Design an enzyme around this catalytic site. Structure first.
Site, PDB file in Angstrom:
ATOM      1  N   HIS A 102      -7.455   9.225  -2.077  1.00  9.29           N
ATOM      2  CA  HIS A 102      -7.001   9.305  -0.619  1.00  9.29           C
ATOM      3  C   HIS A 102      -8.042   9.761   0.392  1.00  9.29           C
ATOM      4  O   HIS A 102      -8.124   9.170   1.485  1.00  9.29           O
ATOM      5  CB  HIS A 102      -5.706  10.225  -0.617  1.00  9.29           C
ATOM      6  CG  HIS A 102      -4.813   9.627   0.414  1.00  9.29           C
ATOM      7  ND1 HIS A 102      -3.315   9.449   0.357  1.00  9.29           N
ATOM      8  CD2 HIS A 102      -5.021   9.076   1.662  1.00  9.29           C
ATOM      9  CE1 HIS A 102      -2.992   9.052   1.418  1.00  9.29           C
ATOM     10  NE2 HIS A 102      -3.878   8.935   2.278  1.00  9.29           N
ATOM     11  N   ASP A 127       0.777  -1.340   0.028  1.00 10.79           N
ATOM     12  CA  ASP A 127      -0.212   0.087   0.038  1.00 10.79           C
ATOM     13  C   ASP A 127       0.988   1.302  -0.103  1.00 10.79           C
ATOM     14  O   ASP A 127       1.547   1.338   0.937  1.00 10.79           O
ATOM     15  CB  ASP A 127      -0.871  -0.175   1.144  1.00 10.79           C
ATOM     16  CG  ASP A 127      -1.802   1.187   1.254  1.00 10.79           C
ATOM     17  OD1 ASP A 127      -2.788   1.074   0.483  1.00 10.79           O
ATOM     18  OD2 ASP A 127      -1.565   1.996   2.084  1.00 10.79           O
ATOM     19  N   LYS A 154      -2.374   6.078  -3.908  1.00 11.72           N
ATOM     20  CA  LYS A 154      -3.697   7.100  -3.659  1.00 11.72           C
ATOM     21  C   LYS A 154      -3.637   8.408  -4.519  1.00 11.72           C
ATOM     22  O   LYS A 154      -2.312   8.868  -4.463  1.00 11.72           O
ATOM     23  CB  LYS A 154      -3.881   7.037  -2.368  1.00 11.72           C
ATOM     24  CG  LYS A 154      -3.712   5.744  -1.417  1.00 11.72           C
ATOM     25  CD  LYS A 154      -3.996   5.937  -0.095  1.00 11.72           C
ATOM     26  CE  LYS A 154      -3.632   4.764   0.811  1.00 11.72           C
ATOM     27  NZ  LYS A 154      -2.344   4.557   0.741  1.00 11.72           N
ATOM     28  N   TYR A 209       3.253  10.147   0.710  1.00  8.64           N
ATOM     29  CA  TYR A 209       4.184   9.371   1.676  1.00  8.64           C
ATOM     30  C   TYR A 209       5.571   9.753   1.663  1.00  8.64           C
ATOM     31  O   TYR A 209       6.352   9.712   2.337  1.00  8.64           O
ATOM     32  CB  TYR A 209       4.005   7.989   1.783  1.00  8.64           C
ATOM     33  CG  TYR A 209       2.708   7.314   2.188  1.00  8.64           C
ATOM     34  CD1 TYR A 209       1.789   8.289   2.611  1.00  8.64           C
ATOM     35  CD2 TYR A 209       2.338   6.100   1.862  1.00  8.64           C
ATOM     36  CE1 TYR A 209       0.455   7.845   2.998  1.00  8.64           C
ATOM     37  CE2 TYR A 209       1.158   5.525   2.275  1.00  8.64           C
ATOM     38  CZ  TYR A 209       0.132   6.326   2.928  1.00  8.64           C
ATOM     39  OH  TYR A 209      -1.244   5.846   3.204  1.00  8.64           O
TER      40      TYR A 209
HETATM   41  N1  LIG Z   1      -5.844   5.918   3.525  1.00  6.46           N
HETATM   42  C1  LIG Z   1      -5.529   6.527   4.536  1.00  6.46           C
HETATM   43  O1  LIG Z   1      -5.953   7.816   4.635  1.00  6.46           O
HETATM   44  C2  LIG Z   1      -4.598   5.847   5.588  1.00  6.46           C
HETATM   45  C3  LIG Z   1      -4.328   6.294   6.875  1.00  6.46           C
HETATM   46  C4  LIG Z   1      -3.378   5.888   7.795  1.00  6.46           C
HETATM   47  C5  LIG Z   1      -2.710   4.567   7.634  1.00  6.46           C
HETATM   48  N2  LIG Z   1      -2.800   4.028   6.117  1.00  6.46           N
HETATM   49  C6  LIG Z   1      -2.105   2.921   5.642  1.00  6.46           C
HETATM   50  O2  LIG Z   1      -2.343   1.931   6.658  1.00  6.46           O
HETATM   51  C7  LIG Z   1      -0.844   1.377   6.828  1.00  6.46           C
HETATM   52  C8  LIG Z   1      -0.898   0.874   8.336  1.00  6.46           C
HETATM   53  O3  LIG Z   1      -1.275   1.727   9.154  1.00  6.46           O
HETATM   54  P1  LIG Z   1      -0.355   2.606  10.018  1.00  6.46           P
HETATM   55  O4  LIG Z   1       0.974   3.070   9.528  1.00  6.46           O
HETATM   56  O5  LIG Z   1      -1.069   3.950  10.542  1.00  6.46           O
HETATM   57  O6  LIG Z   1       0.039   1.980  11.331  1.00  6.46           O
HETATM   58  P2  LIG Z   1      -0.266   0.287  11.940  1.00  6.46           P
HETATM   59  O7  LIG Z   1       0.150  -0.610  10.804  1.00  6.46           O
HETATM   60  O8  LIG Z   1      -1.257   0.380  12.796  1.00  6.46           O
HETATM   61  O9  LIG Z   1       0.999   0.417  13.002  1.00  6.46           O
HETATM   62  C9  LIG Z   1       2.372   0.629  12.491  1.00  6.46           C
HETATM   63  C10 LIG Z   1       3.448   0.809  13.679  1.00  6.46           C
HETATM   64  O10 LIG Z   1       3.097  -0.561  14.546  1.00  6.46           O
HETATM   65  C11 LIG Z   1       4.618  -1.254  14.345  1.00  6.46           C
HETATM   66  N3  LIG Z   1       4.514  -2.606  14.347  1.00  6.46           N
HETATM   67  C12 LIG Z   1       4.321  -3.464  13.426  1.00  6.46           C
HETATM   68  N4  LIG Z   1       4.217  -4.551  13.351  1.00  6.46           N
HETATM   69  C13 LIG Z   1       4.523  -4.771  14.867  1.00  6.46           C
HETATM   70  C14 LIG Z   1       4.876  -5.800  15.504  1.00  6.46           C
HETATM   71  N5  LIG Z   1       4.494  -7.043  15.045  1.00  6.46           N
HETATM   72  N6  LIG Z   1       4.913  -5.735  17.071  1.00  6.46           N
HETATM   73  C15 LIG Z   1       5.021  -4.468  17.645  1.00  6.46           C
HETATM   74  N7  LIG Z   1       4.992  -3.365  16.879  1.00  6.46           N
HETATM   75  C16 LIG Z   1       4.670  -3.507  15.382  1.00  6.46           C
HETATM   76  C17 LIG Z   1       5.526  -0.324  13.664  1.00  6.46           C
HETATM   77  O11 LIG Z   1       6.866  -0.278  13.908  1.00  6.46           O
HETATM   78  P3  LIG Z   1       8.135  -0.607  13.090  1.00  6.46           P
HETATM   79  O12 LIG Z   1       7.783   0.050  11.481  1.00  6.46           O
HETATM   80  O13 LIG Z   1       9.082   0.339  13.729  1.00  6.46           O
HETATM   81  O14 LIG Z   1       8.262  -1.934  12.959  1.00  6.46           O
HETATM   82  C18 LIG Z   1       4.609   1.042  13.586  1.00  6.46           C
HETATM   83  O15 LIG Z   1       5.461   1.853  14.679  1.00  6.46           O
HETATM   84  C19 LIG Z   1      -0.147   2.369   6.536  1.00  6.46           C
HETATM   85  O16 LIG Z   1       1.346   2.590   6.639  1.00  6.46           O
HETATM   86  C20 LIG Z   1      -0.678   2.972   5.271  1.00  6.46           C
HETATM   87  O17 LIG Z   1      -0.109   2.176   4.277  1.00  6.46           O
HETATM   88  C21 LIG Z   1      -3.690   4.827   5.026  1.00  6.46           C
HETATM   89  C1  LIG Z   2       3.016  16.285  13.608  1.00  7.51           C
HETATM   90  C2  LIG Z   2       3.976  15.826  12.549  1.00  7.51           C
HETATM   91  C3  LIG Z   2       5.324  15.740  12.904  1.00  7.51           C
HETATM   92  C4  LIG Z   2       6.280  15.185  11.771  1.00  7.51           C
HETATM   93  C5  LIG Z   2       5.699  14.780  10.532  1.00  7.51           C
HETATM   94  C6  LIG Z   2       4.461  15.048  10.224  1.00  7.51           C
HETATM   95  C7  LIG Z   2       3.490  15.521  10.981  1.00  7.51           C
HETATM   96  C8  LIG Z   2       2.146  15.625  10.676  1.00  7.51           C
HETATM   97  C9  LIG Z   2       1.539  14.381   9.787  1.00  7.51           C
HETATM   98  O1  LIG Z   2       1.795  13.371   9.968  1.00  7.51           O
HETATM   99  N1  LIG Z   2       0.576  14.825   8.916  1.00  7.51           N
HETATM  100  C10 LIG Z   2      -0.012  14.209   8.006  1.00  7.51           C
HETATM  101  C11 LIG Z   2       0.697  13.546   6.753  1.00  7.51           C
HETATM  102  C12 LIG Z   2      -0.110  12.686   6.232  1.00  7.51           C
HETATM  103  C13 LIG Z   2       0.585  12.000   4.864  1.00  7.51           C
HETATM  104  C14 LIG Z   2      -1.575  12.260   6.314  1.00  7.51           C
HETATM  105  S1  LIG Z   2      -2.503  11.055   5.164  1.00  7.51           S
HETATM  106  O2  LIG Z   2      -3.660  11.827   4.874  1.00  7.51           O
HETATM  107  O3  LIG Z   2      -1.635  10.697   3.920  1.00  7.51           O
HETATM  108  N2  LIG Z   2      -2.931   9.912   6.357  1.00  7.51           N
HETATM  109  C15 LIG Z   2      -1.973   8.893   6.397  1.00  7.51           C
HETATM  110  C16 LIG Z   2      -1.702   7.843   5.282  1.00  7.51           C
HETATM  111  O4  LIG Z   2      -2.520   7.939   4.412  1.00  7.51           O
HETATM  112  O5  LIG Z   2      -1.035   6.861   5.758  1.00  7.51           O
HETATM  113  C17 LIG Z   2      -2.114  12.916   7.493  1.00  7.51           C
HETATM  114  C18 LIG Z   2      -3.454  12.729   7.834  1.00  7.51           C
HETATM  115  C19 LIG Z   2      -1.492  13.732   8.410  1.00  7.51           C
END
Ligand SMILES: NC(=O)c1ccc[n+]([C@@H]2O[C@H](COP(=O)([O-])OP(=O)(O)OC[C@H]3O[C@@H](n4cnc5c(N)ncnc54)[C@H](OP(=O)(O)O)[C@@H]3O)[C@@H](O)[C@H]2O)c1
Ligand SMILES: Cc1ccccc1CC(=O)Nc1cc(C)c(S(=O)(=O)NCC(=O)O)c(C)c1
Length: 316
Positions: free
Chosen positions: A111, A44, A78, A49
């Site tokens: 997005h 993804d 996205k 990003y």
């Molecule tokens: N469409 C949107 O608006 C949107 C919004 C938010 C997120 N997303 C997508 O969803 C993906 C996932 O969400 P997210 O990045 O917000 O967070 P997440 O996957 O919920 O959490 C990532 C965090 O968890 C840690 N982690 C991973 N595996 C672990 C494990 N097995 N044990 C302990 N900790 C672990 C990672 O650490 P390390 O990396 O240090 O291992 C990182 O700090 C994104 O990267 C992005 O592709 C999309």
């Molecule tokens: C406060 C802070 C400090 C250091 C670096 C970034 C930020 C703020 C931040 O992270 N902004 C932000 C960036 C993105 C890139 C998104 S987003 O809309 O892209 N959602 C995350 C995703 O798609 O994984 C959103 C909502 C906020």
């Protein structure tokens, strides 16, 4: 269970993918290479990003090494909010294809339903701090996305962070040619999304759950916010199955028929997060996990609460 889910475009999408938001450019290339080696076939990404060029380097190296074929990969990107205008959509998609070094995307998502003023700034603010919106509407942006499918640039199009009324707006669009194949939304035990998931699935739209682990590395993470990874109730369920809490949190959405994309740049965690096909949570476990909902949101886009298309004012 099946490792892939059928989309309404006829393609199969891997239910487990690797997230890349916040993955440093200097570490994401190795993270994606290790993920592919371990079995991941879904990545993804997003132009916002700022690491799509490095993700592309990993993909090209693995294709070149013949570890995988292009048709076996499912790459998602996205369209950012500043490119919602009809004339900017194709160029935004082409920049992403250029960075990822691919000639097509398996899935391209809008997005956010909110369009921002075009320019070099990802979040344009006015002299008072509010986000400057663009006068574009979701329906016109959708028509531009449909054009990418007809031009061969993307195989499927979808949405992200759309509430049920916004999804309905597209489904009722006059002249609708391609229905959204996926709606990517935040989903975990503290934000279960029962209503929106039921709505989407009933319409044949696949749901992808993001931030499945509660996004512990989110930049705005305040020192004492809730923490899914350290919830004692979830730790107990994991202990009972001899799995880690992260594995339980990843298996959870899978059994709700959702696609899930945990993010990690740590080789050991990338491998651990993929070992979720060898165990099963009971109905009791699932219902219990669903009872932890607190409607807590990691991504609330607070700077756009005034936007006419802000998605989170509605109940779902
Ligand atoms: N469409 C949107 O608006 C949107 C919004 C938010 C997120 N997303 C997508 O969803 C993906 C996932 O969400 P997210 O990045 O917000 O967070 P997440 O996957 O919920 O959490 C990532 C965090 O968890 C840690 N982690 C991973 N595996 C672990 C494990 N097995 N044990 C302990 N900790 C672990 C990672 O650490 P390390 O990396 O240090 O291992 C990182 O700090 C994104 O990267 C992005 O592709 C999309
Ligand atoms: C406060 C802070 C400090 C250091 C670096 C970034 C930020 C703020 C931040 O992270 N902004 C932000 C960036 C993105 C890139 C998104 S987003 O809309 O892209 N959602 C995350 C995703 O798609 O994984 C959103 C909502 C906020």
């Amino acid at each position: 269970m099946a490792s892939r889910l059928l989309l309404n475009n006829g393609a199969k999408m891997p239910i487990l993918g690797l997230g890349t938001w916040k993955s440093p450019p200097g570490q994401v290339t190795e993270a994606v290479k290790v993920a592919i080696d371990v079995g991941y076939r879904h990545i993804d990404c997003a132009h916002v990003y700022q690491n799509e060029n490095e993700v592309g380097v990993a993909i090209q190296e693995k294709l070149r090494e013949q570890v995988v074929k292009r048709e076996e990969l499912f790459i998602v990107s996205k369209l950012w909010c500043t490119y919602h205008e009809k004339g900017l959509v194709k160029g935004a998609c082409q920049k992403t294809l250029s960075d990822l070094k691919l000639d097509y995307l398996d899935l391209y998502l809008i997005h956010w339903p909110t369009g921002f003023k075009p320019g070099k700034e990802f979040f344009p603010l006015d002299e008072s701090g509010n986000v400057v919106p663009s006068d574009t509407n979701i329906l016109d942006t959708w028509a531009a996305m449909e054009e990418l499918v007809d031009e061969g640039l993307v195989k499927a199009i979808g949405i992200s962070n759309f509430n049920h009324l916004q999804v309905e707006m597209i489904l009722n669009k006059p002249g609708l040619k391609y229905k959204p194949a996926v709606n990517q939304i935040e989903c975990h035990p503290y934000l279960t999304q029962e209503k929106l998931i039921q709505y989407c699935q009933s319409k044949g739209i696949v749901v992808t759950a993001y931030s499945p682990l509660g996004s512990p590395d989110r930049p705005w993470a305040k020192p004492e916010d809730p923490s899914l990874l350290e919830d004692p109730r979830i730790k107990a369920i994991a202990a009972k199955h001899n799995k880690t809490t992260a594995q339980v949190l990843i298996r959870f959405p899978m059994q709700r028929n959702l696609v899930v994309i945990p993010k990690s740049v740590t080789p050991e965690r990338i491998a651990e997060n993929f070992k979720v096909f060898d165990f099963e949570l009971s109905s009791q476990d699932m219902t219990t996990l669903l009872s932890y909902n607190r409607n807590w949101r990691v991504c609330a886009l607070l700077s756009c609460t005034s936007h006419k298309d802000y998605p989170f004012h509605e109940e779902f």
